[PDB]
Amino acid sequence: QRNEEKAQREANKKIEKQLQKDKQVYRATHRLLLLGAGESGKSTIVKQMRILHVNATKVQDIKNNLKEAIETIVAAMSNRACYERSNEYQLIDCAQYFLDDQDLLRCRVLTSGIFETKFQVDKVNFHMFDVGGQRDERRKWIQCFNDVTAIIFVVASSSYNMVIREDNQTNRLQEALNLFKSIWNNRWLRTISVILFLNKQDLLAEKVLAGKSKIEDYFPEFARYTTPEDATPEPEDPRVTRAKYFIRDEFLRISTASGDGRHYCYPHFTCAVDTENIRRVFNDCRDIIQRMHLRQYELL
């Protein structure tokens, strides 16, 4: 049939025209991947970014969390003074606030599926998504994310005197360091920058202020550490400023060992509850692309 091809040739033309429209949109977006250990703040950051940029079941969710928190503290600690030694037994963070905007941020929920957020700043397309599995010892899904702009890493810096959930004899912060080392020295992630969020800064000042549970006990290298000469202690007691930079320095040691100029780590001191961190991602994302072009043409 002579007329059979004419319809098919027209069918291709309509479809091939649409692909051009999608080509421009796809090439003009930036994809950001959230990573970190469990109970760090990956969902808290993605919550406020959507609210800040884009913008009845929560009643039951709060009740479920409130009941679980009360039972664990009363029962496990039996083996006001109970909360003093709360590090020995597992406990959620939202126990004190809920029992006594911001309230909706304090809620916690477990992660199943994949959770994506779309937002635009200054007419620039951004697409940030978090990937949640109960636990994967081996990530075989990390080879798919090979063209992202940057990797956002969230780590809890007020969780040195606690122990992981799956294994009851592993230091929580030391587990976060182990995960970063494997991610950094990955065969696929050889040209991906990392943005580091040293989260939960609010609690870190509280722990150091109280005399009990000094950081020297868990990390013996803190005794011989001293504040760097190029320190900009913000506003803060000298004791707190020394504590913050010890944790930041350990992460930079691993990153600076390798990379050969294709890798960079940007450390920030955040507090995901309230700190205005929308511009922080934007400023560093323009530097990643700018450095990438500078590496080309042998200018760097």
């Binding site: 069918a11 291709n12 649409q18 599926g113 899904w141 798919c144």
Partner: protein
């Protein structure tokens, strides 16, 4: 607790006693007098363009004329290899797609990915508007493969160390298979759609039964992950492609590994395997940007297909054995003949 461990060791050692007592001679000694096939060289016939990013999935049709491909930009394009004209283009809700299928009757296409949900689309519909038929959502972990038994049955395997058999009409699991200790990444139904295999990350494969729902055998001759698996046209053998740069051939009746295909200079992984029409060639992809062609009965390499600028992630052979289609990560398909 520890008492049963002694019983487990004796049973495991009992298995090797019978297997070692049946190996009369190796395969190579039996087929020593067979004349070699020669040198096999093929050239690209068509090249298909139009995807915006890398490609993971690919599957032919029963007519061996149309095929479907999936990619990470969110598109599920249907081609026409004879004239190189796209016939459909389905947008997807999620941008992470790791598999696709194509129904034997040609009226459906499947999909899946990191969203832990399998979807079924309808092609031959009134008014020419492709819409989602069902969403088989009761599952955990990312999927790895989907296959169609008929218009109503589908088999899925995921990273939660399980495989399940679905029912599209009600969207519920008829039966579930358990026993793997690692993520599952491939399966291949038998020609009669009564048995299927599966290769997991614990360096083992199993032979399930669809009707009964229980495992039957286990082959443990590898030393790393398993990324692909194919099934001999006879129905009584299958070849496995692992992450240690080797492919092995197993036999169901003899219940032993028969022959190993490996080369010293090859140190890259394997992503796909496939046989030929008569089961004489064993084409296999690789991570070093090209595809090698093996020999079923001699382990003699007989050609290299090196027309790609990136790794090969899928591979397929038409039902009549006329062409070989290989996709890659550079968003280009190729048809060899």
């Amino acid at each position: 607790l520890d008492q049963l461990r002694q019983e487990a060791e004796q049973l495991k050692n009992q298995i090797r006693d019978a297997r070692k007592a049946c190996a009369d001679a190796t395969l190579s000694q039996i087929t020593n007098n067979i004349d070699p096939v020669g040198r096999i060289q093929m050239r690209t016939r068509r090249t298909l363009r139009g995807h915006l990013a890398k490609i993971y999935a690919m599957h032919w049709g029963t007519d061996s004329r149309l095929l479907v491909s999936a990619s990470q930009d969110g598109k599920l394009i249907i081609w026409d290899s004879y004239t190189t004209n796209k016939v459909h283009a389905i947008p997807l809700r999620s941008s992470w797609v790791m598999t696709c299928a194509y129904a034997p009757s040609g009226n459906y296409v499947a999909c899946g990915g990191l969203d832990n949900i399998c979807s079924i689309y309808n092609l031959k519909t009134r008014e020419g508007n492709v819409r989602v038929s069902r969403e088989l959502a009761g599952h955990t972990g990312y999927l790895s493969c989907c296959r169609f038994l008929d218009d109503n049955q589908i088999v899925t395997s995921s990273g939660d160390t399980t495989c399940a058999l679905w029912d599209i009409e009600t969207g519920q699991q008829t039966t579930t298979f358990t026993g793997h200790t690692g993520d599952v990444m491939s399966l291949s139904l038998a020609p009669d759609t009564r048995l299927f295999v599966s290769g997991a990350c614990d360096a083992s494969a199993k032979l399930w039964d669809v009707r009964e729902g229980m495992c039957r055998q286990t082959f443990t001759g590898h030393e790393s992950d398993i990324n692909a698996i194919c099934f001999f046209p006879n129905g009584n053998a299958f070849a496995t492609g692992s992450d240690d740069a080797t492919c092995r051939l197993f036999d169901l009746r003899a219940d032993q590994e028969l022959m190993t295909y490996s080369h010293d200079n090859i140190i890259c992984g394997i992503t796909s395997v496939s046989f030929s029409k008569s089961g004489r060639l064993l084409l296999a992809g690789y991570d070093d940007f090209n595809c090698n062609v093996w020999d079923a009965l001699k382990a003699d390499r007989a050609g290299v297909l090196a027309g790609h600028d990136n790794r090969v992630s899928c591979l397929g052979v038409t039902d009549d054995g006329m062409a070989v289609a290989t996709g890659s990560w550079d968003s280009f398909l190729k048809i060899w003949n």
